[PDB]
Each structure stands twice: as structure tokens, then as C-alpha cells.
Design an enzyme around this catalytic site. Structure first.
Site, mmCIF file in Angstrom:
data_model
loop_
_atom_site.group_PDB
_atom_site.id
_atom_site.type_symbol
_atom_site.label_atom_id
_atom_site.label_comp_id
_atom_site.label_asym_id
_atom_site.label_seq_id
_atom_site.Cartn_x
_atom_site.Cartn_y
_atom_site.Cartn_z
ATOM 1 N N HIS A 125 80.613 49.762 9.368
ATOM 2 C CA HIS A 125 79.756 48.891 10.162
ATOM 3 C C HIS A 125 78.654 48.273 9.313
ATOM 4 O O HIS A 125 77.523 48.758 9.323
ATOM 5 C CB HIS A 125 79.153 49.666 11.334
ATOM 6 N N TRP A 173 75.690 47.549 11.932
ATOM 7 C CA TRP A 173 75.176 48.615 12.783
ATOM 8 C C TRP A 173 74.705 49.802 11.959
ATOM 9 O O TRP A 173 73.876 50.585 12.435
ATOM 10 C CB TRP A 173 76.133 49.014 13.924
ATOM 11 N N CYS A 206 76.866 35.887 23.003
ATOM 12 C CA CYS A 206 78.069 35.083 22.990
ATOM 13 C C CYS A 206 78.082 34.183 21.756
ATOM 14 O O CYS A 206 77.126 33.458 21.525
ATOM 15 C CB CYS A 206 78.117 34.199 24.226
ATOM 16 N N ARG A 223 79.908 36.653 10.994
ATOM 17 C CA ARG A 223 78.697 37.470 10.916
ATOM 18 C C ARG A 223 77.512 36.828 11.642
ATOM 19 O O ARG A 223 76.362 37.102 11.301
ATOM 20 C CB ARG A 223 78.331 37.785 9.456
ATOM 21 N N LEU A 224 77.776 35.975 12.638
ATOM 22 C CA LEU A 224 76.709 35.265 13.335
ATOM 23 C C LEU A 224 76.012 36.163 14.373
ATOM 24 O O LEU A 224 74.801 36.055 14.566
ATOM 25 C CB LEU A 224 77.283 33.987 13.951
ATOM 26 N N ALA A 225 76.765 37.068 15.008
ATOM 27 C CA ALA A 225 76.241 37.964 16.040
ATOM 28 C C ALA A 225 75.118 38.851 15.492
ATOM 29 O O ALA A 225 74.053 38.967 16.104
ATOM 30 C CB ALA A 225 77.370 38.791 16.621
ATOM 31 N N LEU A 245 74.293 43.350 34.960
ATOM 32 C CA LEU A 245 74.881 42.159 35.540
ATOM 33 C C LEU A 245 75.974 41.639 34.597
ATOM 34 O O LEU A 245 75.944 41.815 33.382
ATOM 35 C CB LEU A 245 73.785 41.112 35.759
HETATM 36 C C1 LIG Z 1 63.733 46.213 20.359
HETATM 37 C C2 LIG Z 1 64.572 45.041 20.881
HETATM 38 C C3 LIG Z 1 66.028 45.133 20.307
HETATM 39 C C4 LIG Z 1 66.861 43.947 20.768
HETATM 40 C C5 LIG Z 1 68.338 43.996 20.308
HETATM 41 C C6 LIG Z 1 69.058 45.209 20.879
HETATM 42 C C7 LIG Z 1 70.519 45.205 20.400
HETATM 43 C C8 LIG Z 1 71.379 44.073 21.028
HETATM 44 C C9 LIG Z 1 72.875 44.472 20.834
HETATM 45 C C10 LIG Z 1 73.784 43.438 21.508
HETATM 46 C C11 LIG Z 1 74.204 43.905 22.896
HETATM 47 C C12 LIG Z 1 74.987 42.771 23.570
HETATM 48 C C13 LIG Z 1 75.467 43.192 24.937
HETATM 49 C C14 LIG Z 1 76.441 42.175 25.529
HETATM 50 O O1 LIG Z 1 76.079 41.053 25.852
HETATM 51 S S1 LIG Z 1 78.073 42.687 25.667
HETATM 52 C C15 LIG Z 1 78.988 41.150 25.756
HETATM 53 C C16 LIG Z 1 79.318 40.601 24.360
HETATM 54 N N1 LIG Z 1 80.005 39.319 24.518
HETATM 55 C C17 LIG Z 1 81.340 39.143 24.469
HETATM 56 O O2 LIG Z 1 82.107 40.085 24.281
HETATM 57 C C18 LIG Z 1 81.820 37.724 24.673
HETATM 58 C C19 LIG Z 1 82.922 37.265 23.703
HETATM 59 N N2 LIG Z 1 82.674 37.710 22.331
HETATM 60 C C20 LIG Z 1 81.901 37.118 21.504
HETATM 61 O O3 LIG Z 1 81.262 36.120 21.840
HETATM 62 C C21 LIG Z 1 81.808 37.679 20.105
HETATM 63 O O4 LIG Z 1 83.043 38.338 19.746
HETATM 64 C C22 LIG Z 1 80.637 38.638 19.856
HETATM 65 C C23 LIG Z 1 79.364 37.783 20.023
HETATM 66 C C24 LIG Z 1 80.665 39.791 20.875
HETATM 67 C C25 LIG Z 1 80.682 39.230 18.424
HETATM 68 O O5 LIG Z 1 80.705 38.131 17.507
HETATM 69 P P1 LIG Z 1 81.898 38.015 16.413
HETATM 70 O O6 LIG Z 1 83.111 38.548 17.069
HETATM 71 O O7 LIG Z 1 81.824 36.581 15.944
HETATM 72 O O8 LIG Z 1 81.535 39.053 15.202
HETATM 73 P P2 LIG Z 1 80.430 38.734 14.066
HETATM 74 O O9 LIG Z 1 81.089 38.469 12.717
HETATM 75 O O10 LIG Z 1 79.489 37.679 14.519
HETATM 76 O O11 LIG Z 1 79.726 40.143 13.896
HETATM 77 C C26 LIG Z 1 80.454 41.341 13.770
HETATM 78 C C27 LIG Z 1 79.456 42.437 14.116
HETATM 79 O O12 LIG Z 1 79.159 42.363 15.524
HETATM 80 C C28 LIG Z 1 79.323 43.649 16.109
HETATM 81 N N3 LIG Z 1 79.681 43.447 17.526
HETATM 82 C C29 LIG Z 1 80.851 43.002 18.037
HETATM 83 N N4 LIG Z 1 80.729 42.961 19.382
HETATM 84 C C30 LIG Z 1 79.475 43.377 19.703
HETATM 85 C C31 LIG Z 1 78.771 43.586 20.899
HETATM 86 N N5 LIG Z 1 79.318 43.318 22.104
HETATM 87 N N6 LIG Z 1 77.495 44.023 20.857
HETATM 88 C C32 LIG Z 1 76.916 44.299 19.703
HETATM 89 N N7 LIG Z 1 77.543 44.129 18.540
HETATM 90 C C33 LIG Z 1 78.825 43.675 18.526
HETATM 91 C C34 LIG Z 1 80.435 44.285 15.284
HETATM 92 O O13 LIG Z 1 80.507 45.718 15.360
HETATM 93 C C35 LIG Z 1 80.050 43.807 13.904
HETATM 94 O O14 LIG Z 1 79.048 44.642 13.336
HETATM 95 P P3 LIG Z 1 79.491 45.767 12.286
HETATM 96 O O15 LIG Z 1 80.446 46.671 13.006
HETATM 97 O O16 LIG Z 1 80.080 44.831 11.256
HETATM 98 O O17 LIG Z 1 78.202 46.496 11.907
HETATM 99 C C1 LIG Z 2 78.544 46.307 35.679
HETATM 100 N N1 LIG Z 2 79.553 45.409 35.130
HETATM 101 C C2 LIG Z 2 80.855 45.902 34.688
HETATM 102 C C3 LIG Z 2 79.243 44.003 35.033
HETATM 103 C C4 LIG Z 2 80.374 43.465 34.186
HETATM 104 C C5 LIG Z 2 81.044 42.280 34.878
HETATM 105 N N2 LIG Z 2 82.112 42.031 33.937
HETATM 106 C C6 LIG Z 2 81.986 40.953 32.975
HETATM 107 C C7 LIG Z 2 83.235 42.865 33.918
HETATM 108 N N3 LIG Z 2 83.589 43.351 32.697
HETATM 109 C C8 LIG Z 2 84.660 44.158 32.532
HETATM 110 N N4 LIG Z 2 84.999 44.663 31.260
HETATM 111 C C9 LIG Z 2 84.201 44.282 30.098
HETATM 112 C C10 LIG Z 2 86.123 45.591 31.108
HETATM 113 C C11 LIG Z 2 86.455 45.688 29.613
HETATM 114 C C12 LIG Z 2 86.205 47.057 29.099
HETATM 115 N N5 LIG Z 2 86.018 48.006 28.416
HETATM 116 C C13 LIG Z 2 85.437 44.505 33.748
HETATM 117 C C14 LIG Z 2 86.547 45.326 33.683
HETATM 118 C C15 LIG Z 2 87.253 45.623 34.840
HETATM 119 BR BR1 LIG Z 2 88.768 46.755 34.658
HETATM 120 C C16 LIG Z 2 86.855 45.093 36.075
HETATM 121 C C17 LIG Z 2 85.738 44.260 36.190
HETATM 122 C C18 LIG Z 2 85.005 43.943 35.050
HETATM 123 N N6 LIG Z 2 83.912 43.143 35.074
HETATM 124 MG MG LIG Z 3 80.457 35.068 13.936
#
Ligand SMILES: CCCCCCCCCCCCCC(=O)SCCNC(=O)CCNC(=O)[C@H](O)C(C)(C)COP(=O)(O)OP(=O)(O)OC[C@H]1O[C@@H](n2cnc3c(N)ncnc32)[C@H](O)[C@@H]1OP(=O)(O)O
Ligand SMILES: CN(C)CCCN(C)c1nc(N(C)CCC#N)c2cc(Br)ccc2n1
Ligand SMILES: [Mg+2]
Length: 411
Positions: free
Chosen positions: A2, A5, A160, A169-171, A411
Site C-alpha cells: 500500500h 495507506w 470519485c 494515483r489521483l485518489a 449515505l
Molecule cells: C483528519 C481528516 C482526514 C480526512 C481523510 C480521511 C480518509 C479518507 C479516505 C477515503 C474514504 C472514501 C470513502 C468513499 O467515498 S467509498 C467510495 C469510493 N468511490 C468509488 O468506489 C467510486 C468508483 N471508484 C473510483 O472512483 C476510484 O476507483 C477510487 C477513487 C475509489 C480510487 O481511485 P483509483 O482507482 O483511480 O486509484 P488511485 O491510483 O487513484 O489510488 C490508488 C490508491 O487508492 C486506494 N483506494 C482505492 N479505493 C479506495 C477507497 N474507496 N477509499 C480509500 N482509498 C482507496 C488504494 O488502496 C490505493 O492506495 P494504496 O493501496 O496504493 O496505498
Molecule cells: C449504508 N450504505 C450501504 C449506503 C451505500 C449505498 N450504496 C452505494 C450501496 N453500496 C453497496 N456496496 C458498495 C456493496 C459492495 C460491497 N462490498 C451495496 C451493496 C448491496 Br449487496 C446492496 C446495496 C448497496 N448499496
Molecule cells: Mg487515479
């Protein structure tokens, strides 16, 4: 494994998590003065953008990015389609910080390419009860209670990255910048959920679904006719019968929540929630925002008897784009939100939720096995879905707990 992370103040293994006994921060204390005032560097072709949630146009831009590039199922059958009204509701609760909404735009054309959102939340996140009295047994009580007071932290959602920019590596950059903007406001912890496993969840719960209109669900392969239903003919007649609900609620006293309900809803919710290890604390303003009925978005009903609110439930709507499908474009899902029962068995309160959801044209009701959601699974004919919601803290050491000890709905 990671690259990102591993650089972060989160637990790095399931062991680390299993060992921990006391709630507390991971990192050593810092001050706002220690945090860079200038945004994190970004490629010169991109720019940081702070959208205005009070701008229909900004919300629209965010909506489109999420409509086309947000969470899909594992089979790329369905993509969540959070509405513009939903996003305004989620993104702008009382006393939200505009700065915590963080977007990356392409400089040339101002196309939105990535987004992450932080909102304020007051959270109880002190040592769980099961670790707290074990601390008492060992004479470690004050250490276990150091961080019992609700903390004003950040809740992260809606990360997203555009499909075209994935795996570049944008996330990590987004997370770094969000962290900075939050730190700069003297906030050092965050709470976030995801379907994927990252280091390292403090709790994990299966999803559960309850078919409301099984014909459609089967049409779009959200559901397959279970192997067993093919011992009769007309297994769609039997399925329909299986999931049938009344047209009208069974509980007299059931009506929509209104603004004057706010104080009583608050009281009974807070009393219920306070029995959980991790859970939110809401002001009256927050109860108003998150629970007052809001068209297409949130639906809230109380049981009032003798001018007295004794029980309530809420659900919110998230449709999904059905990714191909000749017949259907949209799946209409109700998610169980906050609730409290004090005069009736919870299974009886939630049946009424299902009845209402159904009447108003929802195809399915979903939830995670948090709160007391497990109590009604079997009777109300919920089935366990694929995958789990995982609960995480940033910069907060916390023992592994059961999902039934978590009271924060995401949500
Ligand atoms: C004190 C305040 C603190 C505030 C911040 C608190 C933390 C916030 C944490 C975020 C909580 C968000 C909660 C939600 O909204 S969960 C919903 C996340 N959204 C989606 O799944 C929608 C579709 N997916 C995408 O848009 C992309 O695939 C995402 C954006 C998810 C990754 O983009 P991409 O696919 O282009 O990859 P990369 O090259 O940019 O980067 C790769 C790195 O990203 C790590 N990765 C992958 N998925 C996630 C994930 N869901 N949370 C955290 N990290 C994630 C991964 O392990 C790797 O790191 P490492 O393994 O290499 O180390
Ligand atoms: C509290 N809560 C699940 C809000 C999430 C609403 N969404 C986007 C959601 N997400 C889901 N996932 C990410 C499942 C993938 C895994 N692991 C989801 C999965 C199922 Br199965 C039903 C409803 C869902 N609904
Ligand atoms: Mg990226």
C-alpha cells in the site's frame, strides 16, 4: 503493498486492530500552525476547485461526475445514481465547511475529474463498553475513559475519480488535500466507510436487501429466481406472493414527521443511539436537516399517540442506473435510515417502513446489519446481499467491534 495507506495514521493490520484496547489518536498532536497553508501541489494541467453547494450548477457538475463514475456493483450491472437534491442534502448539513468539499478540474475546459466530500459530524468514539470494564478489571479506567466525550470530527464520503483518470494515483492526492483542509480547521480525525477492504476497518457489516417489487428485480438480474422456485410452474407468481405487502400501514398513530416533532424525535433517538459504542450526536438543527421529510430524498414517519411521539423510522432514496437493460433504466431503492421503537417491537415498526416504501414505488429496501437491523431480518424476509460495508477511522486507534455496536448510518 500500500504505497499510500502505509504512509497514513491508520492501523496497518487486522492484528494491530485486534490488539488495541483504548480509543485514542495515532499521530502525535499537531497544530493548525504546523499545516501548510498552500494547497498540495498538483499537475499544472489540473486545478483544485472548491465547488459551491449553494450553486445549482456546481451541484449539477458533481452530479454528472457521480452519475457516470461512482460506485458500481462487482458485475458492473448497476451504478448508484444519487440525485442533485440528494447531494445538496448530504453535502450541506448545518454548519458545513465549504472548504471540505474538494474537487479536481482540468484547467483547459474546467471538466470535473475527481471529487471528495467532508461533512462535520459529532461522534461518540470512546472506548467500547466491552473493553472499558475489562479496563476496570485491570485498574485502567481513566485511560479507557479519556476520550468518552463526543468529538467534532469529519465524515468523508463521495470519493470519485473519473474512469479516464483511474489508477494514476489521483485518489491519494485528493485524500491528502482533504486531510490538509480538515487539519487546517483544527480537526484531526475522520470517519469513513467503503465496500472495499483497506487498512484497517474497525467494524464490518453485510448488506441486506428486501424485495418490494420482485418482478422488476428479476427483469434486471438484481435478483435471480432462486434455484428452488422452479419446482412449480409460475415461479414469478409464487415470488410475487412471497414478497407481497399490505397497501396500508398497520400501526394507527403513523403519520409523516413535522417540524414540531424535532425535539421529541431527538430525545428518543439520542436515548437509543447512546446504547451503541460508536454513534452520532445530533443538535435540533441536525435532526431537522437529516430527518425532516424532503421530496425524493428522505422520508420520515413517527408514531404519535396522545400527542406523544413514541417511535419513528426514516429511509432515504438512492436509485441506480441499470447499466444495459432494454426494459428498465432505473432501480429505485429505499435505505433504512435512523429509527427508534419504544412502544412496539422493532419488526412491527419496520414492516410499516416496508409498506410505505412499497406504496411510494420503491423496488427494494436495503440496509447494513448495524443498529438493531439484525432483529428483523428473518421475519421481514430480508436476505444478505454480496459484500460488506467496512467502517474506518483516520487517526484513531479503536478496537475491532461488531457491526451491531455501530450507530452511524452512512449515505
Ligand atoms: C483528519 C481528516 C482526514 C480526512 C481523510 C480521511 C480518509 C479518507 C479516505 C477515503 C474514504 C472514501 C470513502 C468513499 O467515498 S467509498 C467510495 C469510493 N468511490 C468509488 O468506489 C467510486 C468508483 N471508484 C473510483 O472512483 C476510484 O476507483 C477510487 C477513487 C475509489 C480510487 O481511485 P483509483 O482507482 O483511480 O486509484 P488511485 O491510483 O487513484 O489510488 C490508488 C490508491 O487508492 C486506494 N483506494 C482505492 N479505493 C479506495 C477507497 N474507496 N477509499 C480509500 N482509498 C482507496 C488504494 O488502496 C490505493 O492506495 P494504496 O493501496 O496504493 O496505498
Ligand atoms: C449504508 N450504505 C450501504 C449506503 C451505500 C449505498 N450504496 C452505494 C450501496 N453500496 C453497496 N456496496 C458498495 C456493496 C459492495 C460491497 N462490498 C451495496 C451493496 C448491496 Br449487496 C446492496 C446495496 C448497496 N448499496
Ligand atoms: Mg487515479
Amino acid at each position: 503493498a500500500h504505497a499510500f495507506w502505509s504512509t497514513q495514521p491508520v492501523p496497518q493490520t487486522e492484528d494491530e486492530t485486534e490488539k488495541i484496547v483504548f480509543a485514542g489518536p495515532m499521530d502525535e498532536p499537531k497544530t493548525v500552525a504546523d499545516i501548510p497553508e498552500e494547497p498540495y501541489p498538483i499537475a499544472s494541467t489540473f486545478e483544485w476547485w472548491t465547488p459551491n453547494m449553494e450553486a445549482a450548477d456546481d451541484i449539477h457538475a458533481i452530479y454528472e461526475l457521480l452519475r457516470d463514475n461512482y460506485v458500481e456493483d462487482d458485475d458492473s450491472m448497476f451504478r448508484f445514481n444519487y440525485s442533485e437534491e440528494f447531494l445538496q442534502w448530504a453535502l450541506c448539513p448545518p454548519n458545513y465547511i465549504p472548504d471540505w468539499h474538494v474537487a479536481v478540474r482540468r484547467k483547459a475546459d474546467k471538466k470535473l475529474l475527481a471529487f471528495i466530500a467532508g461533512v462535520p459530524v459529532t461522534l461518540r468514539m470512546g472506548t467500547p463498553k466491552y473493553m472499558k470494564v475489562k479496563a476496570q478489571e485491570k485498574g485502567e479506567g481513566e485511560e479507557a475513559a479519556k476520550y468518552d466525550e463526543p468529538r467534532h470530527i469529519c465524515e468523508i464520503n463521495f470519493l470519485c475519480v473519473h474512469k479516464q483518470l483511474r489508477e494514476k494515483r489521483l485518489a491519494p492526492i485528493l485524500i491528502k488535500e482533504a486531510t490538509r483542509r480538515v487539519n487546517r480547521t483544527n480537526v484531526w480525525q475522520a470517519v469513513y466507510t467503503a465496500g472495499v477492504l483497506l487498512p484497517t476497518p474497525y467494524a464490518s457489516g453485510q448488506y441486506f436487501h428486501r424485495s418490494l417489487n420482485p418482478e422488476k428485480l428479476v427483469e434486471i438480474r438484481f435478483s435471480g429466481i432462486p434455484a428452488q422456485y422452479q419446482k412449480f410452474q409460475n415461479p414469478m407468481a409464487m415470488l410475487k406472493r412471497n414478497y407481497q405487502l399490505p397497501s396500508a400501514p398497520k400501526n394507527s398513530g403513523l403519520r409523516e414527521m413535522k417540524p414540531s416533532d424535532v425535539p421529541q424525535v431527538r430525545r428518543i433517538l439520542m436515548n437509543y443511539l447512546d446504547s451503541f459504542d460508536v454513534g452520532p450526536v445530533f443538535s435540533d438543527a441536525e435532526i431537522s436537516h437529516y430527518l425532516l421529510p424532503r421530496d425524493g430524498v428522505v422520508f420520515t414517519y413517527v408514531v404519535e399517540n396522545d400527542k406523544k411521539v413514541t417511535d419513528f423510522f426514516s429511509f432515504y432514496r438512492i436509485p441506480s442506473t441499470v447499466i444495459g437493460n432494454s426494459n428498465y433504466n432505473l432501480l429505485n431503492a429505499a435505505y433504512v435510515h435512523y429509527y427508534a421503537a419504544t412502544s412496539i417491537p422493532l419488526h412491527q415498526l419496520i414492516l410499516d417502513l416496508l409498506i410505505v416504501a412499497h406504496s411510494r414505488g420503491f423496488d427494494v429496501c436495503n440496509m447494513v446489519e448495524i443498529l438493531d437491523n439484525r432483529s428483523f431480518v428473518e421475519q421481514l424476509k430480508f436476505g444478505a446481499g454480496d459484500g460488506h460495508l467496512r467502517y474506518y477511522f483516520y487517526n484513531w486507534a479503536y478496537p475491532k467491534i461488531k457491526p451491531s455496536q455501530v450507530a452511524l448510518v452512512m449515505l
